[PDB]
Design a protein around this ligand. Structure first.
Ligand SMILES: OC[C@H]1O[C@@H](O[C@H]2[C@H](O)[C@@H](O)[C@H](O[C@H]3[C@H](O)[C@@H](O)[C@H](O[C@H]4[C@H](O)[C@@H](O)[C@H](O[C@H]5[C@H](O)[C@@H](O)[C@H](O)O[C@@H]5CO)O[C@@H]4CO)O[C@@H]3CO)O[C@@H]2CO[C@H]2OC[C@@H](O)[C@H](O)[C@H]2O)[C@H](O)[C@@H](O)[C@@H]1O
Ligand SMILES: [Ca+2]
Ligand SMILES: [Cl-]
Length: 511
């Protein structure tokens, strides 16, 4: 089998935001990430004053010191106000990453670390302190531990006092408006038992965003942090949706337009980044790809699923493709809405996973997804660990892009056109840096479970590429190994065999 691949370094150049190399949980530590997020269900009820938070439906609706544990804080460090967040951001500073920090909006945060909160102990109660967005009183760097309040702008002031503003090298750059609000009543019923309203969500968002922007106008505000397509569609059947939907195609549009309107009235941009989560509903062999590695058909579906992000020709097996295919592929659809209803707003996928964490199918899916995100105008993207412990093949995909040689060498910063004759069995992504005519980066993969192909590359560039080095991973080894070089290239064409279930990063030089 031969496939032909055409790369034109002059064509479709566009910047790849480095923050697409991003994560929630830190992985092995040698992925050379550019962005880190402190978010997810635990952050909704996180109390900065004492570092306590609540698991919600994930664990017993338990209030406890988990986030201190997770961040590696000592018992003594866990007593210091803001320590989970400052320890997190100190690590970002050390690693050179963007920090995105979630702020609370569901309305209360954990008052203690005394464990499960029963139904009748729902907020307000002794187990909860109330969130107030703007203190309207002198800020304290040592907040009042004895009252019933946590003030969000006081916390932002605390961060700015320590690190400077977002516009500075050391500042915390992004803040998120809580986490998965259409799931508050399911995940955090002890905090917000009623289903969130569409108007409610906008009002809470405008109030919190104003408070933040009053402390740091340069910080980027991310919202609405939607869990998945049911929330994109109608905010999980929000009780007021029929009353507010007017002529909107989906809640995505209502939110964008209402945030744009509120920003007008306020005289400042209140939404910087439109923030979604995306866990594929794609099925294969009777199994959702995010649930477990699955069988051969689950593995095949996992590697094809990234096409739902971009490819108009691809129809996955899911309830979304079944009943809502006019909203797919998802990235161009989201971009269409953002550009129309709040021009200039960025797009982020702040929690996602394709599953198969320790399977070559998971590695290849992610090697495709990182290429796709980079060249589809996504500002920031953060993997979420659905499986605890090592996620060897996810880490492999990041390292293939960001530390392929053990020296933190990376894919280029500029996407360029790469086309393949077979979009089912292969995917391919190309890049240069600063319009280089010296070095060209190609990430290529074979998704076939059974059949190698010979990839015949045809390159267009200003100079003649003369040789290449190759690194890769496959089903036998998740570590990125050096592969046989490309020792002779003639007239900017060369052939390289890609075995089944293999991903390579090829680096061509002029020289
Ligand atoms: O870790 C991430 C995050 O996960 C959360 O869990 C969520 C699951 O991941 C997710 O799969 C689940 O999705 C379901 C949606 O909640 C649900 O609304 C959706 O309903 C679909 C039907 O599946 C579909 O058949 C139906 O089709 C209709 C069609 O609409 C109609 O036009 C036509 O005429 O008829 C068709 C056939 O009848 O359409 C509806 C939507 O319209 O199904 C999804 C798959 O099951 O959501 C999970 C969260 O849901 C929970 O919380 C909210 C409640 O509303 C749900 O009841 C509850 O189960 C974790 O919960 C979260 O903690 C975590 O962070
Ligand atoms: Ca307090
Ligand atoms: Cl949501």
């Amino acid at each position: 089998k031969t496939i032909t691949i055409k790369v034109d370094t002059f064509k479709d150049r566009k910047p790849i935001s480095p923050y697409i190399y991003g994560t929630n949980q830190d992985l092995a530590g040698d992925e050379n990430m550019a962005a880190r997020r402190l978010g997810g269900n635990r952050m909704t009820g996180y109390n900065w004053e004492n570092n306590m938070s609540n698991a919600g439906s994930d664990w017993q609706h338990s209030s406890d010191n988990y986030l201190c544990s997770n961040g590696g804080l000592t018992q003594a460090e866990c007593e210091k106000p803001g320590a989970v967040v400052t320890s997190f951001h100190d690590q970002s500073l050390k690693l050179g990453t963007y920090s995105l920090v979630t702020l609370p909006m569901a309305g209360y945060v954990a008052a203690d670390g005394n464990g499960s909160v029963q139904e009748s102990e729902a907020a307000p109660s002794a187990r909860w302190n109330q969130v107030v967005n703007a203190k309207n009183a002198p800020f304290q760097l040592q907040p009042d531990l004895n009252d019933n309040y946590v003030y969000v702008d006081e916390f932002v002031h605390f961060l700015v006092n320590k690190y400077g503003t977002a516009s500075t090298k050391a500042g915390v750059k992004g803040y998120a408006l809580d986490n998965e609000p259409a799931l508050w009543s399911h995940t955090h019923p002890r905090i917000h038992p009623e289903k969130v309203g569409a108007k409610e969500l906008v009002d809470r968002s405008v109030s919190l965003s104003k408070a933040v922007k009053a402390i740091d106008a340069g910080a980027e505000v991310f919202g609405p942090v939607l869990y998945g397509f049911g929330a994109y569609k109608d905010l999980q059947t929000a009780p007021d949706w029929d009353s507010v939907k007017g002529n909107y195609s989906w809640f995505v549009d209502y939110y964008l337009d209402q945030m744009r309107l509120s920003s007008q009235v306020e005289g400042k941009r209140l939404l910087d980044v439109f923030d979604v989560h995306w866990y594929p509903e794609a099925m294969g062999g009777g199994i959702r790809i995010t649930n477990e590695v699955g069988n051969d058909e689950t593995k095949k579906a996992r590697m094809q699923a990234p096409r739902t992000l971009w490819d108009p020709t691809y129809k996955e097996d899911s309830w979304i493709a079944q009943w809502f295919s006019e909203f797919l592929p998802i990235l161009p659809r989201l971009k269409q809405s953002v550009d129309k209803y709040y021009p200039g707003t960025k797009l982020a996928m702040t929690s996602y996973s394709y599953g198969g964490e320790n399977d070559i199918s998971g590695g290849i899916a992610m090697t495709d997804v990182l290429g796709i995100l980079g060249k589809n105008d996504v500002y920031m993207a953060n993997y979420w660990k659905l499986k605890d412990g090592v996620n060897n093949y996810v880490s492999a995909a990041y390292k293939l892009y960001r530390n392929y040689d053990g020296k933190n060498s990376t894919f280029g910063d500029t996407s360029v056109s790469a086309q393949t004759s077979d979009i089912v069995n292969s995917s391919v992504h190309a890049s240069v840096t600063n319009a280089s005519d010296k070095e060209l980066h190609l990430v290529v993969m074979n998704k076939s479970m059974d059949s190698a192909f010979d990839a015949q590359f045809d390159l267009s560039g200003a100079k003649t590429y003369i040789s290449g080095k190759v690194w890769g991973f496959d089903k036998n080894s998740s570590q990125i190994k050096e592969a046989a070089p490309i020792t002779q290239i003639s007239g900017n064409r060369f052939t390289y065999t890609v075995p089944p279930l293999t991903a390579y990063h090829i680096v061509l030089t002029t020289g």
